[PDB]
Protein backbone atom coordinates (compact mmCIF):
# COMPACT_ATOMS: atom_id res chain seq x y z
CA UNK A 1 0.00 0.00 0.00
CA UNK A 2 3.01 2.29 0.42
CA UNK A 3 4.12 2.54 -3.24
CA UNK A 4 0.44 3.27 -3.89
CA UNK A 5 0.26 5.81 -1.08
CA UNK A 6 3.33 7.52 -2.52
CA UNK A 7 1.85 7.58 -6.01
CA UNK A 8 -1.46 9.04 -4.87
CA UNK A 9 0.32 11.99 -3.23
CA UNK A 10 1.68 12.88 -6.64
CA UNK A 11 -1.69 12.31 -8.30
CA UNK A 12 -3.45 14.84 -6.09
CA UNK A 13 -0.55 17.24 -6.73
CA UNK A 14 -1.04 16.84 -10.49
CA UNK A 15 -4.83 17.14 -10.26
CA UNK A 16 -4.50 20.45 -8.42
CA UNK A 17 -2.51 21.94 -11.32
CA UNK A 18 -4.33 20.39 -14.30
CA UNK A 19 -7.83 21.20 -13.02
CA UNK A 20 -7.01 24.61 -11.55
CA UNK A 21 -10.12 26.58 -10.58
CA UNK A 22 -12.23 23.59 -11.72
CA UNK A 23 -11.12 21.88 -8.53
CA UNK A 24 -11.07 18.10 -8.48
CA UNK A 25 -12.08 14.95 -6.67
CA UNK A 26 -9.83 12.25 -5.29
CA UNK A 27 -11.28 8.85 -4.39
CA UNK A 28 -8.66 6.26 -3.26
CA UNK A 29 -11.36 3.54 -3.23
CA UNK A 30 -10.53 0.22 -4.95
CA UNK B 1 -10.18 4.51 -10.30
CA UNK B 2 -7.37 7.01 -10.78
CA UNK B 3 -4.96 4.97 -8.64
CA UNK B 4 -5.41 1.63 -10.44
CA UNK B 5 -5.32 3.69 -13.66
CA UNK B 6 -2.54 6.19 -12.95
CA UNK B 7 -0.15 4.22 -10.69
CA UNK B 8 0.36 1.28 -13.04
CA UNK B 9 0.60 3.55 -16.08
CA UNK B 10 1.69 7.20 -16.41
CA UNK B 11 -1.50 9.14 -16.95
CA UNK B 12 -1.19 12.02 -19.37
CA UNK B 13 -2.41 15.53 -18.63
CA UNK B 14 -5.57 14.64 -20.54
CA UNK B 15 -6.22 11.43 -18.60
CA UNK B 16 -5.73 13.39 -15.39
CA UNK B 17 -8.27 15.99 -16.53
CA UNK B 18 -10.95 13.30 -16.51
CA UNK B 19 -10.76 13.60 -12.71
CA UNK B 20 -11.52 17.29 -12.70
CA UNK B 21 -14.85 18.72 -11.59
CA UNK C 1 12.71 3.39 13.06
CA UNK C 2 10.09 5.38 11.16
CA UNK C 3 11.43 4.22 7.78
CA UNK C 4 11.41 0.47 8.49
CA UNK C 5 8.03 1.11 10.16
CA UNK C 6 6.38 3.56 7.76
CA UNK C 7 7.78 2.52 4.35
CA UNK C 8 6.73 -1.12 4.52
CA UNK C 9 3.35 -0.24 6.00
CA UNK C 10 1.24 2.94 5.73
CA UNK C 11 1.60 4.66 9.08
CA UNK C 12 -1.54 6.35 10.31
CA UNK C 13 -1.66 9.92 11.57
CA UNK C 14 -1.38 8.50 15.08
CA UNK C 15 1.66 6.34 14.31
CA UNK C 16 3.29 9.37 12.73
CA UNK C 17 2.63 11.43 15.86
CA UNK C 18 4.89 9.09 17.82
CA UNK C 19 7.74 10.84 15.98
CA UNK C 20 6.76 14.27 17.19
CA UNK C 21 8.70 16.17 19.84
CA UNK D 1 17.84 2.80 -1.21
CA UNK D 2 15.93 4.94 -3.71
CA UNK D 3 12.38 3.69 -3.01
CA UNK D 4 13.32 4.27 0.63
CA UNK D 5 14.73 7.71 -0.09
CA UNK D 6 11.51 8.58 -1.90
CA UNK D 7 9.39 7.34 0.98
CA UNK D 8 11.32 9.28 3.60
CA UNK D 9 10.73 12.55 1.72
CA UNK D 10 7.03 11.98 2.19
CA UNK D 11 7.49 10.96 5.82
CA UNK D 12 9.17 14.23 6.75
CA UNK D 13 6.42 16.05 4.84
CA UNK D 14 3.76 14.24 6.90
CA UNK D 15 5.63 14.78 10.18
CA UNK D 16 5.74 18.53 9.55
CA UNK D 17 1.94 18.67 9.32
CA UNK D 18 0.96 16.17 12.03
CA UNK D 19 3.34 17.57 14.67
CA UNK D 20 2.89 21.24 13.78
CA UNK D 21 4.42 23.57 16.37
CA UNK D 22 5.58 20.47 18.30
CA UNK D 23 8.25 20.10 15.64
CA UNK D 24 9.65 16.64 15.02
CA UNK D 25 12.72 14.50 14.64
CA UNK D 26 13.75 12.44 11.63
CA UNK D 27 16.40 9.74 12.01
CA UNK D 28 17.02 7.68 8.81
CA UNK D 29 19.31 5.31 10.77
CA UNK D 30 18.74 1.55 10.33
CA UNK E 1 7.46 4.10 -15.98
CA UNK E 2 5.57 5.17 -12.85
CA UNK E 3 8.26 4.46 -10.22
CA UNK E 4 10.53 6.38 -12.60
CA UNK E 5 8.03 9.19 -13.01
CA UNK E 6 7.77 9.43 -9.23
CA UNK E 7 11.54 9.51 -8.84
CA UNK E 8 12.03 12.23 -11.43
CA UNK E 9 9.61 14.53 -9.59
CA UNK E 10 11.93 14.35 -6.62
CA UNK E 11 15.01 14.82 -8.81
CA UNK E 12 13.77 18.10 -10.23
CA UNK E 13 12.87 19.16 -6.67
CA UNK E 14 16.43 18.42 -5.53
CA UNK E 15 18.00 20.12 -8.56
CA UNK E 16 16.07 23.31 -7.83
CA UNK E 17 17.62 23.52 -4.35
CA UNK E 18 21.17 22.32 -5.08
CA UNK E 19 21.66 24.54 -8.15
CA UNK E 20 19.82 27.58 -6.82
CA UNK E 21 20.34 30.67 -8.99
CA UNK E 22 22.47 28.52 -11.33
CA UNK E 23 19.22 27.02 -12.54
CA UNK E 24 19.32 23.53 -14.00
CA UNK E 25 18.34 21.27 -16.86
CA UNK E 26 16.19 18.16 -16.72
CA UNK E 27 16.23 15.71 -19.61
CA UNK E 28 14.13 12.53 -19.03
CA UNK E 29 15.49 11.02 -22.28
CA UNK E 30 16.77 7.42 -22.13
CA UNK F 1 21.12 10.44 -17.77
CA UNK F 2 20.10 11.65 -14.32
CA UNK F 3 17.19 9.21 -14.15
CA UNK F 4 19.13 6.03 -15.01
CA UNK F 5 21.83 7.42 -12.68
CA UNK F 6 19.79 8.81 -9.79
CA UNK F 7 16.76 6.47 -9.65
CA UNK F 8 18.72 3.23 -9.33
CA UNK F 9 21.18 4.78 -6.89
CA UNK F 10 20.79 7.69 -4.44
CA UNK F 11 22.69 10.56 -6.01
CA UNK F 12 24.54 12.74 -3.54
CA UNK F 13 24.31 16.52 -3.48
CA UNK F 14 27.52 16.57 -5.51
CA UNK F 15 26.26 14.15 -8.17
CA UNK F 16 23.12 16.24 -8.44
CA UNK F 17 25.19 19.38 -8.96
CA UNK F 18 26.55 17.90 -12.18
CA UNK F 19 23.10 18.66 -13.61
CA UNK F 20 23.28 22.33 -12.78
CA UNK F 21 23.81 25.02 -15.40
CL1 LIG G 1 7.48 8.88 -4.48
ZN1 LIG H 1 7.17 11.06 -4.07
Curated annotation (Swiss-Prot), chains B, C, F:
Disulfide bonds listed in the record: 6-11
Superkingdom field: Eukaryota
Protein's recorded name: Insulin A chain
Source species: Homo sapiens (Human)
Taxon lineage: Eukaryota, Metazoa, Chordata, Craniata, Vertebrata
Gene: INS
Range of the intact protein held here: 90 to 110 of 110
